[PDB]
């Protein structure tokens with residue numbers, strides 16, 4: 001089963017963690033908690049931006065180009081990405097935009113972080129409609145000594 005996990009700035013703008021204007025260690029901890037011990041699928045740009053395989057998870061990179069790092073698994077299609085995961089209960093797709101769009105239709109859950117910050121960007125998470133999803137968990141948090149901005153964690157199930 002496919003799950004998408006993303007951090008959204010205002011107006012659903014998305015980008016690479018290392019380039020966003022916030023510093024939210026609480027969100028990275030949530031991300032870790034929610035992906036640990038699960039396969040993670042990402043596109044090429046996100047892989048390059050993270051730089052090293054995320055430990056404790058199977059890292060899968062979706063790319064039409066040949067692989068350039070033997071430390072991760074490279075696939076060329078959505079179906080191939082899912083076959084390479086094996087029989088696992090949940091597959092975490094971690095973006096970017098195009099990757100989110102290719103898996104959305106198959107996704108059954110969404111783990112989102114809504115961050116209260118305005119960012120200019122050209123890439124946005126795709127629209128999800130109120131009728132197709134149920135918010136099953138939500139948790140609001142204020143900015144603090146370690147977290148630059150306020151954020152809300154949320155879990156949605158396809159309805």
Ligand SMILES: Nc1nc2c(c(=O)[nH]1)N(C=O)[C@@H](CNc1ccc(C(=O)N[C@@H](CCC(=O)O)C(=O)O)cc1)CN2
Pocket residue numbers: 005006007015016017018020025027028029030031032050054055094095112113
């Ligand atoms: N919640 C959430 N989802 C997201 C992002 C995010 O920042 N937050 N990212 C884009 O905004 C993308 C993922 N980018 C990531 C970039 C770096 C790390 C990372 O270093 N995580 C370490 C945590 C240890 C540490 O805290 O340094 C890990 O998971 O092991 C994770 C995700 C997409 N999905």
Ligand SMILES: [Ca+2]
Pocket residue numbers: 017018019020021022023
């Ligand atoms: Ca940053």
Ligand SMILES: [Cl-]
Pocket residue numbers: 042043044045046047095096097099
């Ligand atoms: Cl990407």
